[PDB]
Design a binder for this molecule. Structure first.
Ligand SMILES: Nc1nc2c(ncn2[C@@H]2O[C@H](COP(=O)(O)OP(=O)(O)OP(=O)(O)O)[C@@H](O)[C@H]2O)c(=O)[nH]1
Ligand SMILES: [Mg+2]
Lengths: 72, 48, 560, 75, 77, 93, 48, 106, 81, 82, 97
RNA sequence: CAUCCGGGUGUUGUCUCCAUAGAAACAGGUAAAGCUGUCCGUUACUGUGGGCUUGCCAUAUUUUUUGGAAC
């Protein structure tokens, strides 16, 4: 699970459904369960339609499709 | 750096006395072998 | 016909360049990818077996080598492939830097192009070792069990740490514990522990041990190398559940003891035990040696079939003791893939390439890939002509391209001018380093080491090779430093032609000596005599032989 | 701090409700047995679809992969 | 570095209220407190309420539930 | 048309031209180079063929021709999880 | 099995035989195994 | 434990299989693997026409059935016939067994 | 803690002994010069076995008198030529 | 086995992914795992709708990959030998 | 973890005490179960065996399922004699009175 | 620069000792011989039995084989 290169960057994250979320990655495991920070549901046009989710958020790994390091 | 069988160290130190300015500083007992590693110095003009 | 027997064994005919077992075009096809090239410097003390280690890697790469006699196939004599100068063949000694480019494969079946450079082991040829360190990403430090970590090994470790290269250690000549010193296996394990502990004493922070596969055990006379990971992969992984393999691997070193499926960190009470490495690794090796030398052949082949799944042919069973021992060990230890896996796992570019480049150049930001940028490490006499050994650090180089060459002795002032003019050359021919041949190519890419035939007149000892497309590229250009040859030349000879008529021939030859021998200093007195400085007496013997026999080919008087 | 398998072990002989992943279906019934894979056996069950009580049933076995959640009903 | 399961435990011990997202079933999220956690990320939720996808007004209470790990997309603060 | 022996296993079909179905109703056609525990497949000189929705309705029950689309792919690894069924099209030539 | 045939051209022994012949050969066999013994007392040094 | 080894007994029977996608597969059973991967010969594939006519669900199944390479022009109800097929074990829903089999022995 | 099957054992553990009775002789033969490091070969002519040659290729015993020493030296001369 | 080894022997080349969701990605394979997770760089991307974009670097979970396209050169790589 | 023989006896214990014992009672009693399948088909059959995965060899099968033609909705009623059934397709088993 | 005492390998012939199932029945042909053809023994689909070059033997609970399906 070679996520180390991303482990404190801002990551956008495709998830089951079609519902992008995004946040600063904070940790991962052998299943790709991910924990991430400043978490935002990226529903659409940002100034009203997205939603900030909370101080902590964690994903069950099977639900991730793919992820992108928008801040490299 | 000199590698020699241990019972022949007298010959090596005699040679280091015959050459001018040469000195031996340390002897390493090479573990598990009959060898010694003998560390020293000799001037380059004396090294021929 | 041009003939080269007077100077070197070398393949002049392309039809006789040996056939690789792998497809060679496939190796070129991955030269475009920097992540697939590793440059390996095989360094180590005198007579450590470095050329023999290379002989292993060469033989396993090729189908048939024309220079193989039956004495070498059967293992009576070493091949000594990279020691191909006549002078090296006669002295029994690596004198000059040689190498090969080989497609190599790890225990996971992934392939790399590996460039190996085989540094001379004799202490007075440390200039070549410095060139090897400059060129290499990783270094195999070969040491033999008997003398172990000597002061020469200490300085090689220190220079490797200075040069920002990944160290990996080959503990060679394990047969000399078994056959020469005749140690019982527990004492041999203690010997290996003393060696590995001494290695760790000088590698400042980094830890070396076999379970980390930074240690390789070898006997390049008897044709084998292995790592713990390699041995458990071949002969224990099939007999335990697959989830257990790495944890079983982790326990095959140190103060670990075993009994009937259970492990301890102390010996068992009711039966006296050796450690896990002795039980599972070293005693089987000792038993292979003993039984191959002294067991009845039919019982031996039954044992080998039951244990190692290796069949012995009828012709192999007729072999003499040392060829038979080599044959059995080579059947057991399988083509050096655990050495390639150690090389693969020990080097990470992310931590080292920036530091290496910042050591050999000034520190700064990365080179833009639109520019060609390369380090011309030395001039080499190779076959019927001289070449330049070059590492391409960025960009691409094409055959026939017009390229600019700056000698490293001008780098400091030019760089100061950057912060507040260069000759140019055509790259006539490009060829991969192949030991006893040069394999021509049309391209060379980032991370690759290759020979180049045109640029050799624009510098003496080393150079920066570059090509640019914008003046802003020139403003961002970095120049490689003059290279740190590890030993300073202090052994002096005064030199004069026998007949003064022949002075110009000597001038040409001395230019050639200064080019080919990196560490030699040549200067001319106001007396009209020539002064050569070298590392020591063998070094001077070698270069004076070159003067008399190949380059000046005149009679030369010399002082004491 | 009750863990999931101890919780279901505690719920035995209680009247639970189980909503499935499919067909908007919920079964309500007395929990009889449970295993390591969280398969369920229920007794005197009733089928609810979208909250409409279709009919009562005898013994029931619900396969583990079909359930969304399990809950204790008021008792 | 915080391991994900240790973050789930840091929801558990602090007894903090959280909202959970279902797997493929888009139209619901569930709010409550994490009472239990698991090796397979099954969770026991107390004072649980399912809420549509928008807010607490339209939700309906579930009581104490065990929510099987196969359906958890997110856990959120 | 091809016929293959009742000797059952996929291991005998190396270098045969398979046509391989997937859960999404395309078919991949290529020479089998290797196979795996999970039935991951490697197909050389591979072609994906696919029925667009424009003529998917011509398969409804009533001399017949379907203008299926075809796509070139290079040395595909197919994820076994997606593979629906496998049929043999040609022997090694 | 020890000799090719009565033309008496090739031979092949076992370890017990070669050990016995080596042991008998003690007067007339060479016993200088150390190759460094011949330093400056070998063919090519005599040539030089 | 036992029931994949039950299927392994059934070699050379003219078994009949319904895949999860709904297509029905008649054929001669050559092998069943321990992962339930089944090999058939002298095989006929079919989709039943009361199911088939709803395009929205059955488009995938129909497209797969045609692209086998064995669908002749529709004499009736989208039949295909091929000499050999390998079927992934996960894809099976039902296997209709031969009427003459003595299950009580197994 | 970690464990492995109870019948798991190292390679060549069925053969109890490391040193066979002939191993000492095999080790002695391995290091010997030619022909004793071999176990097969070609027949040579009897006149081609140079029995005395190995003596004068080596340094004589230092106590020997002058006639013996010059004999050694002259035989070396013949060999070199 | 060979297919995972081929995906490792593909690292450093340009590969094309297609996913279960119907997206397609084409780019240089930086790293791949035995689980078929992959990382791509300088990635051309395509939506299920057929809309096209570009992105710097991506990671993909193995389970969601439908197939991977590999450069034709690799048919003669040493992986396939007996 | 546990030894092979212990796992064998554990499987027997699970079949008798666990939730699967509803199917076991019907199998031993030779009385027909009702099984709602994943594709909304309902099998009615007599069980002859089952395993850990809830696969089950069935005999005496009847198989109800329903179809719709526009506004109309209709039932289909296939009969089968001997049938293997892959366990993943099972929603919920009943035991009839 | 030669001579002499010797040596390796390959092919063909010859000599010595020791052998036999068979369709060694018949035709074409080369620097040679199945070099080539008609032909003969049995085996390609199973029941008892040896070996391995494989799989179960090691997997229902997130990355493949025990269905987020069904509409
Ligand atoms: N006993 C034993 N001898 C070896 C082994 N490996 C090499 N040798 C011998 O060691 C001597 C040196 O061989 P090389 O291969 O040239 O060693 P090197 O490291 O290249 O030494 P340099 O020429 O100075 O570079 C030779 O006589 C070899 O036959 C070994 O594993 N065991
Ligand atoms: Mg050397």
């Amino acid at each position: 699970p070679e996520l180390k290169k991303y482990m404190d960057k801002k990551i956008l994250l495709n998830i089951n459904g079609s519902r992008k979320v995004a946040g600063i990655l904070r940790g991962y495991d052998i299943f790709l369960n991910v924990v991430l920070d400043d978490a935002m549901e990226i529903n659409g046009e940002d100034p009203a339609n997205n939603h900030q989710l909370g101080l902590q958020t964690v994903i069950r790994g099977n639900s991730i499709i793919s992820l992108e390091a928008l801040d490299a | 750096d000199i590698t020699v069988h241990a019972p022949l160290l007298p010959i090596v130190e005699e040679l280091m006395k015959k050459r001018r300015g040469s000195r031996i500083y340390k002897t390493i007992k090479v573990a598990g072998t009959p060898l010694l590693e003998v560390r020293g110095q000799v001037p380059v003009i004396e090294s021929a | 016909r041009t003939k080269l027997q007077e100077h070197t064994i070398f393949t002049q005919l392309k039809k006789n360049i040996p056939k690789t077992r792998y497809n060679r075009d496939y190796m070129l096809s991955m030269a475009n990818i920097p992540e697939r090239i590793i440059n390996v410097g095989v360094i180590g003390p005198l007579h450590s077996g470095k050329t023999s280690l290379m002989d292993l890697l060469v033989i396993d790469s090729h189908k048939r080598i024309p220079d193989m006699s039956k004495n070498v196939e059967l293992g009576w004599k070493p091949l000594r492939y990279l020691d191909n100068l006549k002078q090296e063949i006669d002295r029994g000694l690596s004198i000059k830097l040689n190498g090969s480019t080989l497609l190599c494969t790890d225990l996971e079946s992934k392939s790399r192009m590996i460039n190996f450079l085989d540094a001379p082991g004799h202490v007075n040829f440390m200039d070549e070792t410095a060139v090897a360190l400059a060129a290499s990403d990783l270094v195999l430090i070969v040491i033999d069990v008997v003398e172990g970590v000597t002061f020469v090994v200490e300085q090689l470790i220190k220079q490797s740490i200075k040069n920002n290269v990944a160290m990996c250690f080959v503990i060679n000549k394990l047969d000399r514990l078994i056959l020469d010193l005749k140690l019982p296996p527990m004492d041999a394990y203690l010997k290996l522990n003393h060696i590995i502990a001494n290695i760790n004493s000088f590698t400042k922070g980094n830890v070396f041990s076999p379970i980390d596969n930074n240690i390789i055990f070898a006997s390049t006379k008897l044709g084998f190398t292995f790592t713990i990971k390699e041995f458990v992969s071949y002969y224990y992984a099939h007999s335990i559940p697959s989830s257990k393999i790495d944890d079983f691997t982790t326990r095959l070193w140190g103060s670990v003891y075993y009994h009937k499926g259970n492990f301890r960190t102390k010996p068992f009470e009711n039966v006296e035990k050796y450690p896990t490495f002795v039980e599972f690794i070293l005693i089987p090796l000792y038993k292979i040696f003993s039984y191959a030398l002294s067991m009845e052949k039919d019982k031996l082949k039954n044992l080998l079939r039951s244990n190692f799944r290796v069949n012995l042919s009828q012709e192999a069973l007729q072999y003499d003791p040392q060829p038979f021992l080599k044959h059995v060990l080579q059947l057991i230890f399988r083509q050096q893939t655990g050495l390639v896996d150690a090389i693969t796992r020990c080097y990470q570019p992310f931590e080292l390439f920036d530091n290496k480049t910042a050591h050999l150049s000034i520190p700064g930001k990365s080179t833009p890939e639109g520019t060609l940028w390369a380090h011309v490490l030395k001039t080499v006499d190779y076959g019927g002509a001289e070449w330049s050994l070059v590492r391409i650090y960025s960009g691409l180089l094409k055959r026939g391209d017009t390229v600019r060459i700056l000698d490293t002795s001008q780098s400091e002032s030019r760089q100061k001018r950057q912060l507040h003019e260069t000759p140019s050359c055509e790259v006539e021919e490009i060829g991969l380093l192949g030991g006893r041949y040069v394999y021509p190519v049309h391209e060379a890419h980032k991370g690759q080491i290759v020979l180049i035939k045109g640029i050799s007149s624009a510098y003496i000892k080393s150079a920066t090779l570059y090509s640019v497309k914008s003046k802003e590229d020139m403003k961002q250009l970095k120049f490689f430093k003059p290279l740190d040859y590890i030993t300073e030349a202090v052994f002096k000879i005064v030199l004069q032609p026998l007949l003064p008529r022949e002075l110009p021939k000597l001038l040409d030859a001395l230019n050639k000596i200064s080019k080919y021998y990196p560490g030699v200093i040549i200067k001319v007195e106001e007396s009209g005599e020539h002064v050569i400085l070298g590392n020591g007496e063998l070094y001077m013997d070698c270069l004076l032989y070159d003067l008399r026999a190949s380059y000046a080919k005149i009679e030369i008087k010399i002082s004491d | 701090p009750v863990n999931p398998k101890p919780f279901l072990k505690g719920l035995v002989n209680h009247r639970v409700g189980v909503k499935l992943k499919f067909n908007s279906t919920e079964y309500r019934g007395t929990l009889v047995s449970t295993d390591n894979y969280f398969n369920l056996q229920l007794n005197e069950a009733e089928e609810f679809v979208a909250g409409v009580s279709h009919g009562t049933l005898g013994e029931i076995f619900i396969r583990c992969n079909n359930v969304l959640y399990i809950r204790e009903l008021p008792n | 570095m915080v391991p994900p399961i240790n973050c789930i435990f840091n929801f558990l011990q602090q007894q903090t209220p959280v909202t959970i997202w279902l797997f493929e079933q888009i139209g619901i999220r569930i709010k409550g407190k994490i009472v239990g956690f698991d090796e397979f990320m099954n969770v026991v939720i107390d004072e649980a309420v399912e809420i549509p996808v928008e807010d607490v007004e339209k939700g309906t209470p579930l009581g104490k539930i065990l929510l099987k790990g196969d359906n958890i997309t997110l856990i959120t603060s | 048309k091809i016929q293959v022996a009742h000797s059952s296993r996929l291991a005998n079909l190396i270098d045969y031209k398979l046509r391989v179905l997937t859960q999404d109703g395309r078919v991949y056609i290529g020479q089998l180079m290797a196979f795996d525990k999970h039935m991951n497949l490697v197909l050389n000189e591979c072609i994906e063929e696919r029925v667009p929705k424009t003529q998917l309705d011509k398969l409804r029950p009533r001399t017949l021709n379907i203008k299926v689309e075809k796509r070139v792919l290079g040395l595909t690894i197919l994820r076994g999880e997606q593979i629906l069924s496998t049929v043999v099209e040609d022997k090694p030539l | 099995k020890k000799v090719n045939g009565t033309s008496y051209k090739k031979w092949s022994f076992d370890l017990p035989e070669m050990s016995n012949l080596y042991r008998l050969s003690t007067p007339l066999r060479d016993e200088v195994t150390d190759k460094n013994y011949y330093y400056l007392f070998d063919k090519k040094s005599f040539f030089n | 434990m036992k029931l994949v080894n039950f299927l392994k007994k059934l070699r050379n029977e003219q078994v009949t299989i319904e895949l999860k996608n709904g297509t029905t597969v008649w054929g001669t059973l050559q092998s069943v693997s321990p992962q339930m991967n089944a090999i058939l010969t002298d095989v006929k594939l079919t989709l039943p026409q009361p199911r088939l006519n709803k395009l929205n669900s059955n488009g995938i199944a129909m497209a797969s059935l045609y692209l086998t390479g064995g669908q002749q022009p529709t004499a009736s109800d989208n039949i295909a016939s091929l000499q050999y097929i390998n079927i992934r074990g996960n894809t099976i829903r039902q296997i209709i067994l031969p009427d003459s089999l003595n299950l009580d022995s197994l | 803690d970690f464990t492995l099957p109870e019948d798991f054992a190292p390679l060549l553990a069925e053969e109890e002994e490391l040193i066979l009775p002939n191993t000492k002789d095999a080790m002695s033969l391995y290091h010997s010069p030619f022909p004793f490091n071999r176990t097969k070969g070609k027949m040579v002519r009897a006149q081609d076995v140079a029995l005395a040659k190995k003596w004068f290729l080596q340094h004589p015993d230092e106590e020997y008198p002058v006639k013996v020493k010059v004999s050694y030296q002259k035989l070396l001369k013949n060999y070199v030529l | 086995g060979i297919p995972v080894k081929l995906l490792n022997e593909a690292q450093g080349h340009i590969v094309s992914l297609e996913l279960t969701t119907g997206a397609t990605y084409r780019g240089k394979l930086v790293e791949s795992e035995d689980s078929m997770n992959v990382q791509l760089r300088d990635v051309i991307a395509t939506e299920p709708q057929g809309a096209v974009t570009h992105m710097d670097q991506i990671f993909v979970r193995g389970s969601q990959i439908k197939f991977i396209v590999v450069p034709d050169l690799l048919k003669n790589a040493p992986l396939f030998k007996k | 973890e546990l030894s092979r023989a212990e796992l064998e006896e554990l499987e027997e214990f699970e079949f008798k005490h666990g939730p699967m014992s509803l199917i076991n009672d019907a199998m031993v009693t030779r009385t027909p179960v009702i099984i709602s399948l994943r594709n909304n088909h309902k099998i009615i059959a007599r069980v002859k065996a089952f395993d850990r995965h809830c696969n089950m060899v069935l005999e005496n099968v009847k198989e109800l399922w329903t179809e719709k033609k526009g506004k109309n909705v209709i039932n289909r009623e296939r009969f089968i004699s001997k049938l293997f059934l892959r366990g993943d397709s099972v929603i919920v088993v009943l035991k009839t009175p």
